[PDB]
Amino acid sequence: GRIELIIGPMFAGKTTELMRRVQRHKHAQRSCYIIKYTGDTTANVSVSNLHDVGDEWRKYDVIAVDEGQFFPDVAAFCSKAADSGKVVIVSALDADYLQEPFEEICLLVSRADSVVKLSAVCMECHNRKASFTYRTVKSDERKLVGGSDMYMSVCRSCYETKRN
Amino acid sequence: HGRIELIIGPMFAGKTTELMRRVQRHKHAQRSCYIIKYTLTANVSVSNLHDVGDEWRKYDVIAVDEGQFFPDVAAFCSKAADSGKVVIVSALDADYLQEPFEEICLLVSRADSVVKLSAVCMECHNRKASFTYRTVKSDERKLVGGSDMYMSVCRSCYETKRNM
Amino acid sequence: AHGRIELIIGPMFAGKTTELMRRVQRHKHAQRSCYIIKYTANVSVSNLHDVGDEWRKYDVIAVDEGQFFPDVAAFCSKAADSGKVVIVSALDADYLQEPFEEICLLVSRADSVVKLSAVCMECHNRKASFTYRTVKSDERKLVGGSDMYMSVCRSCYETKR
Amino acid sequence: HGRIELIIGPMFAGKTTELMRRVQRHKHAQRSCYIIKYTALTANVSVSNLHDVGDEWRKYDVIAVDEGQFFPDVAAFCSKAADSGKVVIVSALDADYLQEPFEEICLLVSRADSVVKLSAVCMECHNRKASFTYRTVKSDERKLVGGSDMYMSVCRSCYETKRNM
Ligand SMILES: CC1CN([C@H]2C[C@H](O)[C@@H](COP(=O)(O)O)O2)C(=O)NC1=O
Ligand SMILES: CC1CN([C@H]2C[C@H](O)[C@@H](COP(=O)(O)O)O2)C(=O)NC1=O
Ligand SMILES: CC1CN([C@H]2C[C@H](O)[C@@H](COP(=O)(O)O)O2)C(=O)NC1=O
Ligand SMILES: CC1CN([C@H]2C[C@H](O)[C@@H](COP(=O)(O)O)O2)C(=O)NC1=O
Ligand SMILES: [Zn+2]
Ligand SMILES: [Zn+2]
Ligand SMILES: [Zn+2]
Ligand SMILES: [Zn+2]
To answer: How far is residue C5's CA from residue C17's CA, in Å, rounded to a whole number?
Structure first.
């Protein structure tokens, strides 16, 4: 596509997939510009929103955005870039720890040529595919950067049990 | 082992065909399927999913066609999947203005599986199409019809056909 | 991911033919011409040589039940080299879990390969990637449906052996 | 609940990346993974054929085989492992530089629960998906280990044009 979107819960390998795709384009001598979030820990810039990238991205064939849920203007950015002929690849969570959608990523679903939702493996039961991220630490902050020390991926029934 | 599977994409992408392909697979394994449309294999047409009542509980698989028309689809699918049903939904992710059907987006975040199909561009005939363009003048977001009122188009065709 | 040769495989009752048709319908809707070949536009033949050159007038060529045609790889390659979108639905494996060599060859020549699954008709609980023959017969080709075959998961296939 | 998953496609399609993506998923769920290359615990081994791995693989939940086309006995190995309840994941070329199949990988297709054929991007025209590997050095050895110094991935028409010479 022109906008390709990779979603799924944490630990599903979304970033790995993003990089797999970028690497394919790099082997064909296509120029890739990789955008990461400031906060999150193959890169080009780290920013807190996509406005701050300015116009540098126009010099490249492929634009990759990692952790798309953190950028509040991601839909507009991707559309602008794709209209300028760029292949835009975005990796992002579709859902927060409360199973509520990141509205901006949803909007991207509707504008995307390609949408792939990856799965993880349930870290609780170890037996099923996992489509949900459960927060293991008490915090009401929606944006809380961290890894397996603060989150685990779970299947539907594990998510319910743990919520109780 | 309930689950939610979601099939999205623009019109003429064969979403309904895919829904039926999946249902047929379960039917061959003697699993009971209940098919809901917007007005054992059981069939019913309703205007909202509340109106289906509890009949669906007697079945292994629940299929919902044209999910964008049901305003309570997310809740329904979650209830059914929590009761152990395999729930399969076919739906438009985007309206004719490229805006998301908010309820289907919510379903993306709750789904075990998400597949976004493409159509073929009906304007240029040369590219994959991820968008639906309305060919008749009307501002009603809900307007039931086929190729007499809509065509599927690629990204650039959608832009050019919008400007004229 | 589509292409010039697209291949759809999997066991019986996986909906391969349905998927083939889904893809054909997409093209038809974009006013592309489609020629549909079945085993003994539309035509039924016993091998693809017998179709002659009629296929050249069409944008898309669809072959259903590809495992039955002994020359399918060559046909698909000729057609795809002539600019056709070639879509083939076929069993990858026979009832003894042995490959249909001509397909497995196509795999290597295909732009796109999708292996569909069925639902296990024995345990009713798991995805099925194998076809088990339920009637006694040693003919590798034996045309029929759920009266002669069922699709099964790996462990059911073993146990039923 | 053993299974065989097969990842195929031409060179530079990210097959090995995908293999590792899948392994990493299992690792995060504390499943043990044993990774076999050609010559929660993750074990690694390099061998020239799969007989040489012996029985160590039985201690693990997931078995991953990279570069499957190099192992002449891969089908039998995967089937044995999957029958013992292992999740077996294989990354391999389906086709050689002459577009001929690796027969053993084809056999695996027929035994696999899952088959995914990845594509690369055409390194010649830069404009299309690539499903074929073209060898850029003169050699008749079917096995010739190397990277972009000896191979490029190409689309169908580029493969044809390049072959004409
Ligand atoms: C589930 C999460 C995750 N996160 C964070 C944790 C990680 O830093 C990041 C997920 O990275 P990933 O897309 O899995 O490579 O987002 C939230 O801020 N809110 C949530 O509700
Ligand atoms: C693009 C559309 C389509 N529709 C309607 C027309 C069709 O009856 C139906 C699409 O059927 P489908 O989901 O493609 O099997 O949705 C809308 O109401 N609003 C839109 O914006
Ligand atoms: C499993 C089979 C099935 N068949 C036949 C039975 C059906 O006529 C056909 C099924 O193809 P389909 O799955 O519909 O595309 O193939 C064989 O000839 N040999 C086998 O080993
Ligand atoms: C196309 C090839 C490639 N090769 C080699 C080059 C690499 O070492 C390896 C492929 O790596 P890959 O499966 O992409 O991780 O196989 C052959 O020996 N013969 C062929 O015909
Ligand atoms: Zn679980
Ligand atoms: Zn177009
Ligand atoms: Zn079974
Ligand atoms: Zn090319």
So the answer is: 16
**Alpha-carbon span B29 to B46, nearest angstrom:** 27
Chains near B with 3+ CB pairs less than 8 A apart are A, C
Distance of CA C28 to the CA centre of its chain: 20
CA nearest to B1 within chain A: A157
Structure tokens at D143: 């096995």
**Fold of the domain built from segment(s) B118-164:** Wheat Germ Agglutinin (Isolectin 2); domain 1 (3.30.60)
**Chain B closest CA to A22's CA: distance in Å?**
21
Residue of chain C with shortest Cα separation from B26: C119
Surrounding ion ligand 6 within 5 Å at CB are: B 121, 123-124, 127, 154, 157
Cβ–Cβ of A106/B108 closer than 8 Å?
Answer: yes
Q: Residue D17 and residue A14: Cα distance in Å, rounded?
A: 12
Classify domain B1-117 by CATH architecture.
Answer: 3-Layer(aba) Sandwich (3.40)
To which CATH superfamily is domain C1-116 assigned?
A: P-loop containing nucleotide triphosphate hydrolases (3.40.50.300)
CB pair distance less than 8 Å for B120 and C22: no
CATH topology of domain A119-164: Wheat Germ Agglutinin (Isolectin 2); domain 1 (3.30.60)
Task: Report d(CA A157, CA B111) in Å as an integer.
Answer: 13
Task: Give the whole-angstrom CA distance, residue C122 versus residue C119.
Answer: 9
Pull the structure tokens for residue A64: 């990759």
CA distance A120 to A69: 18
Q: Are C2 and C112 in contact (CB under 8 A)?
A: yes
Q: Do domains C1-116 and C117-161 have the same CATH topology?
A: no
Write the CATH number of the domain with boundaries D119-165.
Answer: 3.30.60.20
Q: Could you tell me which residues are beta bridge partners of residue C50?
A: none
CATH 3.30.60.20 describes domain C117-161:
yes
Helix or strand or coil: residue A29? coil
Residue nearest to atom 8 of ligand 3 (CA): C143
Residues 6 or more apart whose Cβ sits within 8 Å of residue A17:
A6, A91, A116, A118, D18, D21
CATH class for the domain made up of D1-118: alpha beta
D110 Cβ contact list (under 8 Å, min separation 6): C92, C93, C97, C98, C99, C100, C104
- The residues near D141 (Cβ < 8 Å, ≥ 6 apart) are none
Angle at D49 between CA D46 and CA D54, to 5 degrees: 80
Name the residue ranges covered by the structural domains of chain D. 1-118, 119-165
Distances (CA, A) of A137 to A144, A162, C160, D35: 10, 12, 49, 33
Q: Which residues contact A72 (CB under 8 A, 6 or more apart)?
A: A49, A104
Closest by CA position to A163, among listed A135, A144, A143, A130: A135
What 3-state class would DSSP assign to B44?
strand
Helices (H), chain B: 15-28, 73-82, 102-110, 155-163
